Amino acid sequence: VSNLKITNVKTILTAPGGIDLAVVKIETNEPGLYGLGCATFTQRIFAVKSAIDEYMAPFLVGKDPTRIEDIWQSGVVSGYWRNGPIMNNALSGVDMALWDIKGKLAGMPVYDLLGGKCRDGIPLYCHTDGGDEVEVEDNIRARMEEGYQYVRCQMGMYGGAGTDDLKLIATQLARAKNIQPKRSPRSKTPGIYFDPDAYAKSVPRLFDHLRNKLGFGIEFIHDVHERVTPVTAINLAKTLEQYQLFYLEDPVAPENIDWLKMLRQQSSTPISMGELFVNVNEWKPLIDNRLIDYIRCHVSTIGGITPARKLAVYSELNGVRTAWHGPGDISPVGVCANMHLDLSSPNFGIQEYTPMNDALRDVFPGCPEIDHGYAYLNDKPGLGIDIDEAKAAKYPCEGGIPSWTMARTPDGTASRP
Amino acid sequence: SNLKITNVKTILTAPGGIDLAVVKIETNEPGLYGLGCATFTQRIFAVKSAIDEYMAPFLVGKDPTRIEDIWQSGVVSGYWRNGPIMNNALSGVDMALWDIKGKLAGMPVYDLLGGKCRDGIPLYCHTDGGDEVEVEDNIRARMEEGYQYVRCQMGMYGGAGTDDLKLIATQLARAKNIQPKRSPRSKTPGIYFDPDAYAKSVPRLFDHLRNKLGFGIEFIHDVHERVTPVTAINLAKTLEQYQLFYLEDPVAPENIDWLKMLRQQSSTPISMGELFVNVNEWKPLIDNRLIDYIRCHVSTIGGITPARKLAVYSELNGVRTAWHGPGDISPVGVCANMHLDLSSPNFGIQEYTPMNDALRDVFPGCPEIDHGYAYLNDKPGLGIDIDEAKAAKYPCEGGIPSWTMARTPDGTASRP
Ligand SMILES: O=C(O)[C@H](O)[C@@H](O)[C@H](O)[C@H](O)CO
Ligand SMILES: O=C(O)[C@H](O)[C@@H](O)[C@H](O)[C@H](O)CO
Ligand SMILES: [Cl-]
Numbered sequence: 001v002s003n004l005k006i007t008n009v010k011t012i013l014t015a016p017g018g019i020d021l022a023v024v025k026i027e028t029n030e031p032g033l034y035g036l037g038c039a040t041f042t043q044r045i046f047a048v049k050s051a052i053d054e055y056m057a058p059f060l061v062g063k064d065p066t067r068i069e070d071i072w073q074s075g076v077v078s079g080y081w082r083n084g085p086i087m088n089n090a091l092s093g094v095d096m097a098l099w100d101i102k103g104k105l106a107g108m109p110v111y112d113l114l115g116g117k118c119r120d121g122i123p124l125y126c127h128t129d130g131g132d133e134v135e136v137e138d139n140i141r142a143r144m145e146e147g148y149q150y151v152r153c154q155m156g157m158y159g160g161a162g163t164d165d166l167k168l169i170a171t172q173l174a175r176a177k178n179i180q181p182k183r184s185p186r187s188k189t190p191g192i193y194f195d196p197d198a199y200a201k202s203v204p205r206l207f208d209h210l211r212n213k214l215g216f217g218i219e220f221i222h223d224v225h226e227r228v229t230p231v232t233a234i235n236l237a238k239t240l241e242q243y244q245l246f247y248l249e250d251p252v253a254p255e256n257i258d259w260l261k262m263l264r265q266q267s268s269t270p271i272s273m274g275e276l277f278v279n280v281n282e283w284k285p286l287i288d289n290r291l292i293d294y295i296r297c298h299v300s301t302i303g304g305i306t307p308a309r310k311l312a313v314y315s316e317l318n319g320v321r322t323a324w325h326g327p328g329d330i331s332p333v334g335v336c337a338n339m340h341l342d343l344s345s346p347n348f349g350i351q352e353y354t355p356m357n358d359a360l361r362d363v364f365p366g367c368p369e370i371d372h373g374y375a376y377l378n379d380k381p382g383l384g385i386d387i388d389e390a391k392a393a394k395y396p397c398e399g400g401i402p403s404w405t406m407a408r409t410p411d412g413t414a415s416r417p
Numbered sequence: 418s419n420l421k422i423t424n425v426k427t428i429l430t431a432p433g434g435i436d437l438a439v440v441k442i443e444t445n446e447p448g449l450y451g452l453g454c455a456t457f458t459q460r461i462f463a464v465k466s467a468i469d470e471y472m473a474p475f476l477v478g479k480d481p482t483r484i485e486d487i488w489q490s491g492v493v494s495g496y497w498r499n500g501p502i503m504n505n506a507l508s509g510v511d512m513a514l515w516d517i518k519g520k521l522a523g524m525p526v527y528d529l530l531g532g533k534c535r536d537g538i539p540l541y542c543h544t545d546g547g548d549e550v551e552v553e554d555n556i557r558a559r560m561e562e563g564y565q566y567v568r569c570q571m572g573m574y575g576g577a578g579t580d581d582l583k584l585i586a587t588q589l590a591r592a593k594n595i596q597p598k599r600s601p602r603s604k605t606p607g608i609y610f611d612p613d614a615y616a617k618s619v620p621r622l623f624d625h626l627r628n629k630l631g632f633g634i635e636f637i638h639d640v641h642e643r644v645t646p647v648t649a650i651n652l653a654k655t656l657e658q659y660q661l662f663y664l665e666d667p668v669a670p671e672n673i674d675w676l677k678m679l680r681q682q683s684s685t686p687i688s689m690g691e692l693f694v695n696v697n698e699w700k701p702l703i704d705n706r707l708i709d710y711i712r713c714h715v716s717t718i719g720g721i722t723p724a725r726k727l728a729v730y731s732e733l734n735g736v737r738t739a740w741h742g743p744g745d746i747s748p749v750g751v752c753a754n755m756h757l758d759l760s761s762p763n764f765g766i767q768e769y770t771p772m773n774d775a776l777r778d779v780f781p782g783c784p785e786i787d788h789g790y791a792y793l794n795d796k797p798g799l800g801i802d803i804d805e806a807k808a809a810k811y812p813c814e815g816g817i818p819s820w821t822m823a824r825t826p827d828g829t830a831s832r833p
């Protein structure tokens with residue numbers, strides 16, 4: 001296969017799981033040979049589509065798709081300004097599709113191009129929630145019955161607020177029932193109100209209950225989701241040491257990463273950070289200084305497999321493990337990309353997993369097999385995943401803007417959500 | 418009372434031959450509107466989408482007086498954040514809200530911000546040329562016009578020049594006498610440059626310029642991330658004798674840690690930051706006094722609201738401001754830079770790219786330029802307007818630039 005060229009780049013917007021996704025398909029001049037990539041930044045899908053269709057398409061047409069790194073390095077600087085979530089997702093859609101094409105050319109899964117299997121299956125964690133400790137407990141028992149050996153445990157999702165916004169995970173979750181928030185001022189500006197201090201106090205109570213009822217064999221994760229002041233998060237990490245979490249996630253905002261210096265002087269609770277990261281200057285000081293135990297980047301939002309590989313290696317050499325973002329707002333193509341990285345990384349930590357519905361499996365043939373808390377990738381070439389464009393059209397994106405991201409503390413302050 | 422945002426729209430126009438994006442915010446007070454700059458020229462269509470599809474429904478119905486609340490909630494509205502497209506959408510909105518606030522107050526934005534700290538805004542402009550003599554000739558012409566500060570490049574960035582009209586709406590000669598290394602026997606398409614041949618040429622250029630022009634005139638040089646960090650460090654040291662006003666962008670944002678080494682060794686003043694989009698880029702530099710001037714593109718860090726915070730953070734660390742002032746900034750953005758400039762105690766310098774008649778016609782209220790200083794009008798808000806019908810006569814070109822495909826002699830795709 002010589003004189004290989006990119007012929008077309010297109011964006012497919014689809015929501016079979018009830019959450020807006022963006023997927024890139026790159027066609028070549030070799031009949032039947034194409035690649036797929038994930039560009040899912042769900043809150044800005046139309047702007048990602050614009051970045052792909054108006055900019056990436058004329059940048060790529062006619063170029064040899066074999067040169068993944070050169071295309072990545074030149075694409076990243078093509079607009080001069082860079083290091084942002086919309087830009088990165090456009091590059092990710094392209095980059096993953098190129099890895100997909102290379103694996104097809106090689107007759108090899110991407111995990112094989114990257115050095116082959118380092119494990120026999122991919123251990124997963126899934127989410128459990130509830131309005132009180134008993135409901136959280138009940139949900140964890142149901143997941144344990146299914147074979148999950150790791151679970152994230154929240155009571156009232158993030159900051160105890162729950163969610164009524166279907167744009168987040170396509171399902172409503174109850175506010176924490178028994179958290180007594182502070183009284184607000186006499187008129188309130190609209191928002192999703194939460195009480196960071198009432199939330200913080202509830203977390204150790206939740207884990208005390210769960211450990212009493214469920215024991216210490218089951219692995220537990222909790223996500224702070226940047227909801228409290230940094231000293232509150234530090235105190236939280238210290239009080240949770242006794243409950244031996246697999247990790248405590250996002251104790252600080254990316255804008256407050258310096259505070260992890262203080263956190264790591266005091267606490268030995270394992271820490272994860274980074275689903276929000278878009279810049280090397282966010283993650284590099286954390287990893288260089290061993291201020292986290294797991295890196296959490298959303299692969300498409302850091303620009304695809306090419307940069308994720310590099311992050312996985314940088315973390316490896318510093319004893320930091322991977323925990324790629326696995327929410328509902330990631331396409332099955334991105335779930336595959338996370339998993340090809342997972343299977344080939346010596347320093348894989350865990351794979352967050354949001355279970356799919358039948359519509360997702362139908363629109364995307366080749367979804368990883370989930371069997372008793374482990375994921376098993378098929379051994380098909382490239383990413384081992386495909387998209388049925390006609391079936392995708394049955395689930396048009398809803399578009400619009402989320403409501404959950406307007407988070408206000410009791411006095412009405414707009415807060416990092 | 419009961420003041421509300423009623424409409425948010427994006428205006429795309431190119432009166433100076435460079436794609437601009439401007440946001441206009443209308444309100445339920447007849448005649449009362451604001452304008453902001455959202456100019457990220459290489460991505461204008463994605464910026465328009467970010468504004469039209471996301472900012473518009475986020476804003477309509479809200480009280481425009483709450484600028485800080487709108488900025489803090491807007492910045493996190495999509496969860497993910499800290500990028501150039503997102504920040505420019507936010508800036509267009511933010512600057513329009515400051516404009517509206519000034520119109521409500523009957524005061525220029527500089528007056529809302531604390532009043533004038535100076536009697537005019539000193540400017541620098543660009544001088545270029547294919548050899549030292551052409552550069553010198555251009556500086557002399559600008560000095561005759563009253564400029565007391567000039568940026569001096571020979572072959573623009575990396576010695577390569579440019580043929581790409583998307584960059585500044587002018588072709589600039591490659592450096593004539595710079596002898597690049599031989600490339601391999603076939604070359605991947607790009608704009609070729611030689612960082613080593615470039616680096617060696619700069620002290621020769623300044624030796625000539627200081628000999629011919631003396632040390633009264635202020636000189637700026639822009640490294641534009643073109644060389645390895647230790648080469649930039651050595652360049653800083655060799656340029657100390659020429660007493661530059663500043664040496665700009667010796668490193669890429671991805672290499673800011675290297676300024677620790679630079680600042681142990683060199684006393685050439687340094688500026689950084691036109692590329693910055695993230696607090697984690699500029700905060701370590703300012704906290705550790707690794708730069709003397711901060712160079713942010715105001716719209717690209719999210720508008721007047723975040724730029725003011727950055728100016729104060731710099732002020733408290735003895736770092737001065739040098740807001741980005743290229744051709745790819747609308748006159749609304751030029752005004753925003755200058756309202757900050759006039760109200761900041763730690764103002765450093767204002768980069769200025771002269772406008773043509775069409776820009777002045779499309780944007781009534783452009784700052785007066787008089788013998789090397791800018792003089793803002795004293796009109797309320799930003800003191801700037803846009804004639805929409807006249808803007809429509811200059812549609813955007815769109816497409817993609819060629820200058821950002823920069824390759825070293827062996828063919829390596831480089832940070833441009
Ligand atoms: O740990 C997680 O899975 C993340 O916190 C997500 O829940 C994000 O909030 C969501 O992906 C935003 O779109
Ligand atoms: O100092 C400067 O003015 C800059 O380096 C510009 O020339 C940028 O390259 C341009 O604004 C990119 O679009
Ligand atoms: Cl962005």
Ligand SMILES: [Mg+2]
Pocket residue numbers: 223225249250275
């Ligand atoms: Mg999380």
Ligand SMILES: [Mg+2]
Pocket residue numbers: 639641665666691
């Ligand atoms: Mg510059």
